[PDB]
Design a protein around this ligand. Structure first.
Ligand SMILES: *NCc1cc(C)nn1C
Ligand code: NA
Ligand code: NA
Ligand SMILES: [Zn+2]
Length: 265
């Protein structure tokens, strides 16, 4: 073998989880870490914020990968096929992958919280600023990434999520991947694009402080059965002892010298 006996690589267990990450990644204690609690009454409506422009009609999904922490749905990011513009942004940001964070129980799983409330899961659509040419260069910049965060509440099923749920059997363990072409990420959005925004970081090591966070106010509803299937994934590789992929979330971090802005009043 089990990872706690073998290597101290970062993860979500008691011996390698978020409270340990600072040893290898000292920016974990930095000045613009994510996630944060969104205190709805102290967010500031900002009339200079523009509507968010989500252009996903030409998106090209490619593959779904269990990376040992989450699963990533990967996209072709070699052209402006699936881009995020507007909102708080001053550039064009290409979609590279999306993934989720989720809990062992319906009452936890989100990374951001809203008035201290946790959702069952949180979707992150990760985009990089095209002026930096590649994701790797973008994460050397304070405006390199834009992450669209969407909360998942348990209620009615989300039809546009079911293709993701259905394929998870085939990527149960770390390092497994499967074809995932022709997936439309528009099916994961809520009705409204009203949002909160603030400057933050990746929520996984290396925790780089590159992200303009755009967190949608409206959650999507997913069914209990959909999120239950997320919890049958494994952190471990094939042939290793089974450790269910659950509670792969970082808790809220100090807001420090930041003020969350709202696109709506
Ligand atoms: N899980 C492998 C493992 C555990 C210990 C103590 N030694 N090994 C090789
Ligand atoms: Na801006
Ligand atoms: Na299946
Ligand atoms: Zn994430």
């Amino acid at each position: 073998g089990s990872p706690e006996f073998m290597s101290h690589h970062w993860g979500y267990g008691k011996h390698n989880g978020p409270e340990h990450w600072h040893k290898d990644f000292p920016i974990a204690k930095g000045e613009r870490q994510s996630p944060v609690d969104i205190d709805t009454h102290t967010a500031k409506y900002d009339p200079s914020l523009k509507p968010l422009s989500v252009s996903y009609d030409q998106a090209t999904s490619l593959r779904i990968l269990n990376n040992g922490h989450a699963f990533n749905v990967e996209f072709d990011d070699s052209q402006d096929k699936a881009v995020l513009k507007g909102g708080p942004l001053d550039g064009t940001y290409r979609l590279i992958q999306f993934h989720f964070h989720w809990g062992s129980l319906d009452g936890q799983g989100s990374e951001h919280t809203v008035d201290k409330k946790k959702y069952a899961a949180e979707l992150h659509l990760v985009h990089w600023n095209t002026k930096y040419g590649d994701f790797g260069k973008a994460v050397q910049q304070p405006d390199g990434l834009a992450v669209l965060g969407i909360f998942l509440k348990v209620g009615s099923a989300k039809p546009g999520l079911q293709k993701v749920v259905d394929v998870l059997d085939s990527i149960k363990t770390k390092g497994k991947s499967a074809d995932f072409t022709n997936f439309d990420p528009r099916g994961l959005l809520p009705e409204s694009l009203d949002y909160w925004t603030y400057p933050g970081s990746l929520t996984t090591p290396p925790l780089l402080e590159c992200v303009t966070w755009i967190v949608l106010k409206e959650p999507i509803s997913v069914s209990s059965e959909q999120v239950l299937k997320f919890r049958k994934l494994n952190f471990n590789g094939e042939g290793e002892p089974e450790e269910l992929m659950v509670d792969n979330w970082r808790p809220a971090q100090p807001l420090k010298n930041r003020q969350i802005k709202a696109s709506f009043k």
